[PDB]
Design a protein around this ligand. Structure first.
Ligand SMILES: [Mg+2]
Ligand SMILES: [Mg+2]
Ligand SMILES: [Mg+2]
Ligand SMILES: [Mg+2]
Ligand SMILES: [Mg+2]
Ligand SMILES: [Mg+2]
Ligand SMILES: [Mg+2]
Ligand SMILES: [Mg+2]
Ligand SMILES: [Mg+2]
Ligand SMILES: [Mg+2]
Ligand SMILES: [Mg+2]
Ligand SMILES: [Mg+2]
Ligand SMILES: [Mg+2]
Ligand SMILES: [Mg+2]
Ligand SMILES: [Mg+2]
Ligand SMILES: [Mg+2]
Ligand SMILES: [Mg+2]
Ligand SMILES: [Mg+2]
Ligand SMILES: [Mg+2]
Ligand SMILES: [Mg+2]
Ligand SMILES: [Mg+2]
Ligand SMILES: [Mg+2]
Ligand SMILES: [Mg+2]
Ligand SMILES: [Mg+2]
Ligand SMILES: [Mg+2]
Ligand SMILES: [Mg+2]
Ligand SMILES: [Mg+2]
Lengths: 51, 49, 148, 55, 160, 223, 185
RNA sequence: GAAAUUGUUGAAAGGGAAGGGCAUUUGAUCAGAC
RNA sequence: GGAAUACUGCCAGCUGGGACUGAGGACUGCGACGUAAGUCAAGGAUGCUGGCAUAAUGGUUAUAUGCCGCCCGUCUUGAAACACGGACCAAGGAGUCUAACGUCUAUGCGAGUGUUUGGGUGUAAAACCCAUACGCGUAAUGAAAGUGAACGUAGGUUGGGGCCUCGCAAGAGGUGCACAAUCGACCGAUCCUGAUGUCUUCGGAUGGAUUUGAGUAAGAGCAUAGCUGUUGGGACCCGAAAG
RNA sequence: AAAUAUGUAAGAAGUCCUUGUUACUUAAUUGAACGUGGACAUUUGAAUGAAGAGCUUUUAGUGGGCCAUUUUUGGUAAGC
C-alpha cells in the first residue's frame, strides 16, 4: 500500500539485501588500501614539466 | 443532389398531392354498415337467400 | 419517439449540428437529380454505371401473363408429395406403383436439373423440362410426361 | 490561394502510410498464358499422382 | 503558354549516355539470366526506345514476376497519397541489372550454413548474428623514441 | 480442513532461507569482483607510469541519458528518436548501451538531452529509490526480490543486486533487463542546474550534450 | 505533459455483454461467465463470446451442414454445438443419430433429428453433460452470404452489384457498361 | 396578484463609473450537535 | 628527504533543528533481534493531557483591504473596436410529419414469410378468429428468339479457432467450421472448330477460348419496431426586385 | 563532384539433399514452375522500440486561411 525507501529504513534494506549486514559489520566502505611504492619515470616528469 | 451511394428513387410527389389524400378512418364503421345492410336485406327478402 | 432524437441533445448549441461556416441552405446543388451529367458526374459514374442511353428494342403492349414459368429444381421435387405418404413411397415403390407428381397443379412451368434425387421411379407431369433434368429422371428410373 | 502542399504530409501520416499485404500463391493472371495452361495441367497431374501413391 | 506533362518531360540529363559511352551495348547485358523472384534495379538506356520505363522508376528496385521473349515484368511499390500501390512494369532487359546486395546476402547464407555445420562437426555452438562496431579496449602507448612534441597556436602573419 | 499451518509454513520458510543463502553468496562475489577491477586499473596506470608509457583506459560501454527539453516544437526526426529511446517527458531517464548505432542516435537528439557515463553509486541509488518494473503492461514497484525472480529469473537474475550487476557490467541480457525496468521519472535538480541558461552545449556553458562525468552530480541532485 | 504515442481513453472494439433483454439469455451468460472464469477449458470462452453476438453474426445452420460435418474422420460420435438456430433442409434424404445442442430449433429440424434417432438439448444441459467441452464440435453458418455483402465495396472494375430498386433492360445497362455506349467500366 | 419601474422606513458604501475572482478582518444573522 | 593540508570522489558512518501528510481497517506477506516462546521502526498513527460546550469553530450576508479582471452574441486569417444586433421586463418563438429507401440494432417465425382489401364475431372504431389470392424470397443470363447450374467424400494447395490421441507438460500427430489467398469444375452470353442425320435446310452433336455475367458449388429470407443518413413535399424559422 | 533528402535487402513464405507432375521448353534422361520424403530452434541470422495486431461497414464538418526561420521567381522596390 505504501512505497518504503531503502537507503533509509534499515528494515527494508535488510529485507532486500542480506549482504548489507556484513558490509556494515566489517565496515567495507572505509577500506584501507595497502601501500605501494612505484616511482614515476624521468621521461614522464620531464615532459610534464617542460617538454 | 446526388451523393453517398444509394438507389435511385422515383417518388412522384411534385403536384398538389396534399389536396387528394384519402385516409381510411371509417374501416370499422363501413364494416358495421355493410353488416347492417346485409341483415336488413335478408329480413326484407326472407326466406330467399 | 421524439425524446430519443438528437434534436433534443442539440438544444443550446447554436447551429444544431449543421456547421458555422457552411450555414445550412435550401438546395445546395439543385433539386432531385439535377446536374447528373455536369457537376454530379463522378458520383453517377462511380456508383451508377449504365444510367444514360438506350439499349435493346421496344415491346408495345407487353403482357406478363405470357411469360409465366416458375422453375423447380430436381432436388426440391420430393417436397411435392405430402409427408405422410413420402416415406412409404421412399421405401415401398417399384416401377409398378410409382407416384405421379403434377407440377402444374403445384404452380410450376419448367423443371430444371440442379441436385440429386434418390433411386425411386416417379412420373412427372410438366409443361417444359430441360435436357439434364429429363436425363436424371430417366436415370433414376422414371419418365417425364408432357402436358399442355 | 492557387496551390499549396502545406499540411498534406501531416494528413498522410495521421493514419500512417501502409504497405500492402503480400500472400503466398500470387495471382497468375498477367503471367504468360502458355506457362499458365501448362501449370494447370502439371498441378492436376501432381494432384492425381499424390492421390494415387499417397494414401 | 501552358504547362506540359508529356511522357518524357524533364528528362534532359536522365536519359543521356555517359562520357565516351555511346554507341551499342555489350553482350553480357543480353547474356544474363533472370528468374521469377530475382531483385533488379532500374536504370534506363536512352539508346533503346522500346521497352523504356517512366522517369519515376529510374533508380528503383523491384521483384521479377514474369519472364517473356525479350522482356521481364517487375513489381514496384509506389506512394500514392496515404498508401502504397503495387505497379507492374514490363521492361526490356537492356534497362535492368541484378542487385548486388542479394548476391552478398546469398553468399552470407551459404557461409552461415557452412559455419554452423563445421561448428556442429567440431562440437561447439558459434554465434552467427552480425554485431555493430564496439568501443575500444585498453592498451599501452610506449614512448621508445616517440617522445611527445609540444604544439602551440600560430600567430597571424609573422611567419608567413 | 487440512493441517495447513505448519507443513507448508515450514516448507515456505525453508525455501526462503535457501534463496537468501544463494543471494548472500552471489552478493559477496560481486563485491569482490568490483573491488578487484578498480584496484587492478589503478595499479595498471601506476605501472605504465613507472615503465615510462601511458595507459589508455578502455572506452565506456554504458551511458545514462536524461531528457531536458519539454514536448512542444520538436522536429519529426528527433521526436521519433526520443520516442524510440522512451524519453516521452521532461526529466525522464534511461540507460543506453554504447555502439555505433546508438552513437548516431545520440548525435541526432543532442540538443534535447544530457547524457554521461554513470557510476556504480548512482546506478545503485537510482535502482533502489526509483526502480519500477514492467509486469503485464503495468508499472510495479520492485520492493522485493520475488518480483525480480518471477519475471527476470529466466535469465538467471533473481535479486535487485543481480539486476544492478547486469546493468553496470553490460552482460548478455542487458536488453531484457533494461527493457524490464520502467523509464526513470526524476524531479528537478535540488540545487539548480548551475548555469543561467541551459539550452546551450555543456562546453559553451549550458546543459546539453555529453558532460561524461558530471552526470553523477546532476542525477544525484535530481534523484 | 507527455509526448503521447496513441489515443488515450480508447475502448476495445468488442461487445462485452448481449444487447438483448432476453432474461434466459442473461441466465446462460451468467452460467458461462462462471464456467469460463473457474475452468481452464478454451471451449467455455468461445461459447461465452459467441453468446454476445448479433443476428447477422450468428447465421442459421442447416441439418445438411451438420450431417456433412459428422461425415468427418472420427467425428461421427461427437456432440454438435451451434450458438444459434438450427434450420431444416429437404435436399438431404438420410440423417444420422447424433446429439445437437443449440439455442433454437425450427420445428422441422427438431422433428427430423428426433425421427432420425437423436436428441435436441439446450446449452445448460450441455454444460451439465460436459463442463469442459469434452467431445464437442462447434459449427458456424455462412457469414458472407447475406444480400447486403453483394454491394459492399462498390467501384469501377470491382465486380459488385449496384444498389438498385428495379431490374430490366432499361435499368443501368447502357453508357458505362458497354463499349458501344461510350465505355465499359 | 410575478417582473420591469416607483414611494416610505431601517442598514451600509461613495476624492472622475458600477459590477467580478482568490483570500481574510469587521458588523449582522443562522443550522447541526454534544 | 619526510610529512601535512587543499581539490575531487565514496561509506549498506553517526547525529541535531523545521515544515506538510496519516490513505487503509480481523488474520494471511517479506523480514529483523533472540538458543526459543516472544518482541519489533517489518504489506499506510497511535499514546497521554487540557480548555470549551456555545454563536466559540463554521456557514450565509453587507462591506473593507491586497493582487488580478475591457461588452456580450455573430461573420472573419484577424473583435474591446470608430464592423453588425442589443433601453428594460413578461409571455410566445425555429430540424416537424409523410411516401419510398441505405447501413446498423432488437424481436417473431424460418425455405419460407406477411391475420387487419374482405369475411366471422364482439362486453363494439378495441380484443379474438379465418378462406382464396397476392407481394417479397427460394435461378441466372441475353437486345431478343431462347437456354438454364455435382467428373469428384460438392475438388486440390496454403493458413485457421475449437475438439481428439500421446507425452508429467511446452511439444508431436489427427480432424479441421467461419473467414482470407490461389488453381480447377458447372450454368448463360460472345467467338473459334464445325460431324453422324435431315421435307437437304433444317437440325448443332462435339471440342476449345490472355473473352464476358449484378451466377452455381448442403439455401437466408420475410415481417414489425428504433437511432442515424437520403430524395420529393412549405420541409429548421423569417426576407426580394418579379410573373 | 559534396552535405541534406531518396529506393532495396538484412531468412521458416528460409537453406540443403533426394526424386514426382506437365499439353511449356531442350538434341537429350535438359530446364522451368509446383511438390512428396529427409536434415537444420540455448542466436531463427544487425540496433532500438512496440501504448495489442489485422479487417469491415457507415456517416459528420471542411473545401476563404494566415505567420515565422531558411531556399527562391517577377516587379527600383513595399505590410507588392
Ligand atoms: Mg450533422
Ligand atoms: Mg459537363
Ligand atoms: Mg427470362
Ligand atoms: Mg482555394
Ligand atoms: Mg498545423
Ligand atoms: Mg514505335
Ligand atoms: Mg535561470
Ligand atoms: Mg419590484
Ligand atoms: Mg485511517
Ligand atoms: Mg459568524
Ligand atoms: Mg470567523
Ligand atoms: Mg463574516
Ligand atoms: Mg488589470
Ligand atoms: Mg466580439
Ligand atoms: Mg455597435
Ligand atoms: Mg442600435
Ligand atoms: Mg428589441
Ligand atoms: Mg476451394
Ligand atoms: Mg463462362
Ligand atoms: Mg452458395
Ligand atoms: Mg420557408
Ligand atoms: Mg424529409
Ligand atoms: Mg415570401
Ligand atoms: Mg417571366
Ligand atoms: Mg519438404
Ligand atoms: Mg465535400
Ligand atoms: Mg465558404
Amino acid at each position: 500500500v505504501l512505497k518504503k525507501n531503502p537507503l533509509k529504513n534499515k528494515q527494508v534494506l535488510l529485507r532486500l539485501n542480506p549482504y548489507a549486514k556484513v558490509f556494515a559489520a566489517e565496515k567495507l566502505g572505509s577500506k584501507k588500501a595497502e601501500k605501494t611504492g612505484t616511482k614515476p619515470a624521468a621521461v614522464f616528469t620531464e615532459t610534464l614539466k617542460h617538454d | 443532389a446526388i451523393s453517398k451511394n444509394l438507389p435511385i428513387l422515383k417518388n412522384h410527389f411534385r403536384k398538389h398531392w396534399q389536396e387528394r389524400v384519402k385516409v381510411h378512418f371509417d374501416q370499422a364503421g363501413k364494416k358495421v354498415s355493410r353488416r347492417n345492410a346485409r341483415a336488413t336485406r335478408a329480413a326484407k327478402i326472407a326466406p330467399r337467400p | 419517439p421524439s425524446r430519443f432524437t438528437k434534436t433534443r441533445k442539440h438544444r443550446g448549441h447554436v447551429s444544431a449540428g449543421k456547421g458555422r461556416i457552411g450555414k445550412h441552405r435550401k438546395h445546395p446543388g439543385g433539386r432531385g437529380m439535377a446536374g447528373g451529367q455536369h457537376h454530379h458526374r463522378i458520383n453517377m459514374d462511380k456508383y451508377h454505371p449504365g444510367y444514360f442511353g438506350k439499349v435493346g428494342m421496344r415491346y408495345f403492349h407487353k403482357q406478363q401473363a405470357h411469360f409465366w414459368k416458375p422453375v423447380l429444381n430436381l432436388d426440391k421435387l420430393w417436397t411435392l408429395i405430402p409427408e405422410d405418404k413420402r416415406d412409404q413411397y421412399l421405401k415401398s415403390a417399384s416401377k409398378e406403383t410409382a407416384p405421379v407428381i403434377d407440377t402444374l397443379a403445384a404452380g410450376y412451368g419448367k423443371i430444371l436439373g440442379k441436385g440429386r434425387i434418390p433411386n425411386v421411379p416417379v412420373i412427372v407431369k410438366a409443361r417444359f423440362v430441360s435436357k439434364l433434368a429429363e436425363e436424371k429422371i430417366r436415370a433414376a428410373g422414371g419418365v417425364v410426361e408432357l402436358i399442355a | 490561394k492557387n496551390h499549396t502542399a502545406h499540411n498534406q504530409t501531416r494528413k498522410a501520416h495521421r493514419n500512417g502510410i501502409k504497405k500492402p499485404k503480400t500472400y503466398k500463391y500470387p495471382s497468375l493472371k498477367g503471367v504468360d498464358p502458355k506457362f499458365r495452361r501448362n501449370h494447370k495441367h502439371a498441378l492436376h497431374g501432381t494432384a492425381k499422382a499424390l492421390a494415387a501413391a499417397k494414401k | 503558354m501552358g504547362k506540359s506533362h508529356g511522357y518524357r518531360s524533364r528528362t534532359r540529363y536522365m536519359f543521356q549516355r555517359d562520357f565516351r559511352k555511346h554507341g551499342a551495348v555489350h553482350l553480357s547485358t543480353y547474356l544474363k539470366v533472370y528468374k521469377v523472384g530475382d531483385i533488379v534495379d532500374i536504370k534506363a538506356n536512352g539508346s533503346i526506345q522500346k521497352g523504356m520505363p517512366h522517369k519515376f522508376y529510374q533508380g528503383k528496385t523491384g521483384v521479377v514476376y514474369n519472364v517473356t521473349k525479350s522482356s521481364v515484368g517487375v513489381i514496384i511499390n509506389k506512394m500514392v497519397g496515404n498508401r502504397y500501390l503495387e505497379k507492374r512494369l514490363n521492361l526490356r532487359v537492356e534497362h535492368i541489372k541484378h542487385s548486388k546486395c542479394r548476391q552478398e546476402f546469398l553468399e552470407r547464407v551459404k557461409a552461415n550454413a557452412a559455419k554452423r555445420a563445421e561448428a556442429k562437426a567440431q562440437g561447439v555452438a558459434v554465434q552467427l548474428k552480425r554485431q555493430p562496431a564496439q568501443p575500444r579496449e585498453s592498451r599501452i602507448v610506449s614512448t621508445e623514441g616517440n617522445v611527445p612534441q609540444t604544439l602551440a597556436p600560430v600567430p597571424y602573419e609573422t611567419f608567413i | 480442513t487440512a493441517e495447513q499451518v505448519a507443513a507448508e509454513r515450514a516448507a515456505r520458510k525453508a525455501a526462503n532461507k535457501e534463496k537468501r543463502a544463494i543471494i548472500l553468496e552471489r552478493n559477496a562475489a560481486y563485491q569482490k569482483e568490483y573491488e578487484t577491477a578498480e584496484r587492478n586499473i589503478i595499479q595498471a596506470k601506476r605501472d605504465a607510469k613507472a615503465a615510462g608509457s601511458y595507459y589508455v583506459e578502455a572506452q565506456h560501454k554504458l551511458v545514462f541519458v536524461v531528457r531536458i527539453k519539454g514536448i512542444n516544437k520538436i522536429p519529426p526526426k528527433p521526436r521519433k528518436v526520443l520516442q524510440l529511446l522512451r524519453l516521452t517527458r521532461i526529466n525522464s531517464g534511461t540507460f543506453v548501451k554504447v555502439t555505433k548505432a546508438t552513437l548516431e542516435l545520440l548525435k541526432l537528439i543532442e540538443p534535447y538531452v544530457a547524457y554521461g557515463y554513470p557510476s556504480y553509486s548512482t546506478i545503485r541509488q537510482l535502482v533502489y529509490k526509483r526502480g519500477f518494473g514492467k509486469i503485464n503492461k503495468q508499472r510495479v514497484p520492485l520492493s522485493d526480490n520475488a518480483i525480480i525472480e518471477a519475471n527476470l529469473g529466466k535469465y538467471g537474475i533473481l535479486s535487485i543486486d543481480d539486476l544492478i550487476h547486469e546493468i553496470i557490467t553490460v552482460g548478455p541480457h542487458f536488453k531484457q533487463a533494461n527493457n524490464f525496468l520502467w523509464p526513470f521519472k526524476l524531479s528537478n535538480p535540488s540545487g539548480g542546474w548551475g548555469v543561467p541558461r541551459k539550452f546551450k552545449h555543456f562546453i559553451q556553458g549550458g546543459s546539453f550534450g555529453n558532460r561524461e562525468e558530471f552526470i553523477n552530480k546532476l542525477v544525484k541532485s535530481m534523484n | 505533459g507527455i509526448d503521447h504515442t496513441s489515443k488515450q481513453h480508447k475502448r476495445s472494439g468488442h461487445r462485452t455483454a448481449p444487447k438483448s433483454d432476453n432474461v434466459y439469455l442473461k441466465l446462460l451468460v451468467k452460467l458461462y461467465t462462471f464456467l469460463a472464469r473457474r475452468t481452464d477449458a478454451p471451449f467455455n470462452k468461445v461459447v461465452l463470446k459467441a453468446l454476445f453476438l448479433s443476428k447477422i453474426n450468428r447465421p442459421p445452420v442447416s441439418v445438411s451442414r451438420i450431417a456433412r460435418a459428422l461425415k468427418q474422420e472420427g467425428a461421427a460420435n461427437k456432440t454438435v454445438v451451434v450458438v444459434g438456430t438450427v434450420t431444416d433442409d429437404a435436399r438431404i434424404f438420410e440423417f444420422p443419430k447424433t446429439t445437437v445442442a443449440a439455442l433454437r430449433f425450427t420445428a422441422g429440424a427438431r422433428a427430423k433429428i428426433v425421427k432420425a434417432g437423436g436428441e435436441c438439448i439446450t446449452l445448460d444441459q450441455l454444460a451439465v453433460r460436459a463442463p469442459k467441452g469434452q467431445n464437442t464440435l462447434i459449427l458456424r453458418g455462412p457469414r458472407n452470404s447475406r444480400e447486403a455483402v453483394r454491394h459492399f465495396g462498390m467501384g469501377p472494375h470491382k465486380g459488385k452489384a449496384p444498389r438498385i430498386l428495379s431490374t430490366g433492360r432499361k435499368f443501368e445497362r447502357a453508357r458505362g457498361r458497354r463499349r458501344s455506349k461510350g465505355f465499359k467500366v
